[PDB]
Design a protein around this ligand. Sequence first.
Ligand SMILES: *c1c(C)c(C)cc2c1nc1c(=O)[nH]c(=O)nc-1n2C[C@H](O)[C@H](O)[C@H](O)COP(=O)(O)O
Ligand SMILES: Nc1ncnc2c1ncn2[C@@H]1O[C@H](COP(=O)(O)OP(=O)(O)O)[C@@H](O)[C@H]1O
Ligand SMILES: Nc1ncnc2c1ncn2[C@@H]1O[C@H](COP(=O)(O)O)[C@@H](O)[C@H]1O
Ligand code: SF4
Lengths: 608, 189, 233
Amino acid sequence: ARDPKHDILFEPIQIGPKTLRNRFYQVPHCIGAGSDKPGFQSAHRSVKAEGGWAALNTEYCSINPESDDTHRLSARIWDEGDVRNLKAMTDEVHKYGALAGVELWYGGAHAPNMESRATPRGPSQYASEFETLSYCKEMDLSDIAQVQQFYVDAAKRSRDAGFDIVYVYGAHSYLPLQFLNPYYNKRTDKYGGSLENRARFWLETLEKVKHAVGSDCAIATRFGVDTVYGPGQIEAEVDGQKFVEMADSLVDMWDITIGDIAEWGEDAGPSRFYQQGHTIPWVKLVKQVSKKPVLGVGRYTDPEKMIEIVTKGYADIIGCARPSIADPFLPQKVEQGRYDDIRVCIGCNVCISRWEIGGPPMICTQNATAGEEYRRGWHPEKFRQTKNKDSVLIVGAGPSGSEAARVLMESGYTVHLTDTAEKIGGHLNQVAALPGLGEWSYHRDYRETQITKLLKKNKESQLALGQKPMTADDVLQYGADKVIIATGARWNTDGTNCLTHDPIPGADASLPDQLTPEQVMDGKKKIGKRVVILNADTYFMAPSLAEKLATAGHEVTIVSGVHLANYMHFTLEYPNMMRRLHELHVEELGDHFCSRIEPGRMEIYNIW
Amino acid sequence: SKILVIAEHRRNDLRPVSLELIGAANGLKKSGEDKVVVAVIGSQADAFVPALSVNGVDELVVVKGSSIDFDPDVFEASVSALIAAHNPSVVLLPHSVDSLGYASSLASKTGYGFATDVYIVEYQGDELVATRGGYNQKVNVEVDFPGKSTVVLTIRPSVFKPLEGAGSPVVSNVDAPSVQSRSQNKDYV
Amino acid sequence: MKILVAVKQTAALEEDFEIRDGMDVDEDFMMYDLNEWDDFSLEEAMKIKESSDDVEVVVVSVGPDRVDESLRKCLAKGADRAVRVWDDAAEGSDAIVVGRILTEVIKKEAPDMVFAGVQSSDQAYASTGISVASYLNWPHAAVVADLQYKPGDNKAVIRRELEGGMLQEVEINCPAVLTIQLGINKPRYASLRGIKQAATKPIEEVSLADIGLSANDVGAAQSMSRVRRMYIP
Ligand SMILES: *c1c(C)c(C)cc2c1nc1c(=O)[nH]c(=O)nc-1n2C[C@H](O)[C@H](O)[C@H](O)COP(=O)(O)O
Ligand SMILES: Nc1ncnc2c1ncn2[C@@H]1O[C@H](COP(=O)(O)OP(=O)(O)O)[C@@H](O)[C@H]1O
Ligand SMILES: Nc1ncnc2c1ncn2[C@@H]1O[C@H](COP(=O)(O)O)[C@@H](O)[C@H]1O
Ligand code: SF4
């Protein structure tokens, strides 16, 4: 049963005119649905409402076409069409007793407007440091009044759409933050200069929105209380706290983040760099001055960490984005004391990577039903039950084979899962041993735990590890009705690569001076002093091996025929990864690949 | 009447659990007048008299046998002989690998009270009550031993605290039954 | 040549089980399966069988009808024959009473070697095997982590796993009773076809009268301790 100390997480809390039923709150987050895939939006949020979350928010929700994020996908509330589409989500969230919230967004020059082609407006004219070809027009006084009116009209549409909670969004350096922050705001009139003047845009917006919908909706605000950039942007104990004091009477609930837009992996901290609770030192500064309920995200998945921040008085509410994606049912599982059923977010940011690429639906490393609830009918916690006594053999217990076993066992099937490996997890066991990636092990820990419990209740199923490798004869004679082959992949040993699709002459990882990732991670093969990594992969392997090797004292050079760590731009890991490689003295040679290798030397070429 | 502790040693050294058992025995007496006898068994067990001449020990019987260290046939024969000669109310063995080798054999023959891996012992008036685990340690199980004049317990190590300081026990030596054991200890690895 | 492996079907409890009377946990919260140490016992017998020519491996268990499920698993995992001993009067038989029961079926079977697990996962008496040795009057060793034995020899060499990981070699007369420790080998897993074939096999049922015992020899009434109370600490 639930630990009595977690009872606090299930106490209601008032926010203006509305009541949260418990302290579990899904802050606004992208999913790749917006107002364009109303099925996906309504299923994704409503499964979490069924799962016990007290409030579910849309992602950033454009108030007008001159804040259009195309090629990235935002929600929109521009007209009656959008009101109909989003109301599917509010109706569905209400069916499970949760509040529904919308996040009113205007991006200034950060929105590249590739669909609308309209001109964004801003406190001063700048080219966005994130969208570097996108510029805004400087706002005159009427412009300011016009954009304020956009917020008002969107907030009235939001009430029509059935939302309970309406945000003025001033985090990730969007428009209210731009007026606040002298990095953007160069004005010398009464909206620039002193704090009072810099806050005036966001304060008037809040007053107008509260005036229009406040009797009916909680007015929340999301605030990047510190840009984590040092002086020169917003700092929590300089402008941050003082702004909270100025706005406190207008806000029903504070939702606090850190960081800017170009580097918002400081907010959505990758486990590679940040532990659960990494934001606390900045976030707790808000309750030092606010009299209103406060939340601030921090990759919260553990109820022990959750009651800590509430009992100490650092936050009232547990805000979550990623934990709610990994486990829509995290709150119900805490409520029922089913702690070992919690599917814990690994902080890989693959979910975000989809959004960042611009256009595709979200996917999730832990939760293979994220994005699939509506379009495939896949509920994360409900499984169609088999009507036969079919048995399935599964060769390999890596992420795919172990997922297949888990789902088949939850579906009532007899399964026999087998692997040569000592533990569940396949290639993820070495991957999670790379520098910074220890939390990626939760993906296999969850499956190891679940499989062990499913065997206790599915009595004809079996797990066999440390086995002799299955042969074709072993499979054919095994006695299963269906067989799944999940035997994995390996890194190439002969130089085969995406540029030429052929081996490289002289490449051979059986030679004493050449190694694959697996040989490096195994740790047995000796490595010399001067290391060259030859890279044709754009995700984490080459950078992570470079980190591991330079930290162990090697002199490392990366020769990359593809854009090094390109995919880490999308996971938001790229900036701290580059800082890490720089401070470790890893040398990079971009735009080169290799035509032949020999003992102790290789021939490289410029790709252009 | 008497409480019998069977001490334990290996490769020349007394195993500290021996002191914990003296601890337990002393905490269990139903009167200052009850006496704790400790026995140490081995061909060279006279060497342990110094380490066993400690607070709580009223009699130290050294029993010499065939084996230097633990052997199941020797120990069973030796302990049955100690029990018959000292008629103790309670005999305390460590719950140790050595004791697994013979403890339950002592009980099978005899109809003595027997419980293993005991972590609470107590008298409730005149009935001995022992607590051990159940269902993979998820419960405590309290047991008693009706009409049993001799109860044999094995005791979980690192639970009972040893007495402090030295003692002045009457030492005796005896010989094991010279019967040849059906096993032979060879080397340690 | 015959190796007889005594096996036990152990109880595991669901969260959050309840004490029923105060004399036990409520049955509804109990799941039964093959004692973990018995996989290693059984494997060692199968190693011996597979290392030579002709060795009958028989498994034997004292308990009610539900035990059939665990003896079947043994058949699937290599055992040649399975025997179940029972009478309702044996409920509440302690480790020493079960040792007596096992002794009388072992005599009926007349094996060359007896293997027991070091302890059961549920009650962890660490007593039943060695109680069997005492009633059989057979040489015995407890906590065996290595076994050198060839069928028909007089004479086996074991290693005892002591506190702190250290091992002691012991030469032991046969026939002997050995209690087998975790880690001695790598127990095998039967395949679905193995299990299906095990399903066709008989479980031989043996009563107390069959082994010269009666209601008066068994049960809680004949045991060396008496449960006063179970509680969650
Ligand atoms: C998109 C994606 C998928 C991620 C996970 C976060 C995110 C996304 N879009 C957001 C947006 O539409 N508006 C906004 O205010 N915040 C958005 N987020 C950031 C998210 O809300 C959280 O601030 C971070 O993910 C950190 O919280 P947590 O994941 O550690 O709980
Ligand atoms: N013939 C085989 N028999 C049993 N297991 C195998 C065999 N070949 C490969 N495997 C196992 O398959 C697993 C594949 O896992 P992994 O590489 O993580 O693949 P995936 O990412 O698709 O789940 C490894 O744990 C490996 O040991
Ligand atoms: N009811 C039983 N039937 C057959 N063997 C048993 C039974 N109970 C215990 N054993 C044996 O004793 C072993 C160790 O358990 P124990 O002394 O009961 O903790 C088991 O692995 C079996 O070999
Ligand atoms: S993709 Fe990774 S960071 Fe995102 S919710 Fe899933 S497990 Fe967490």
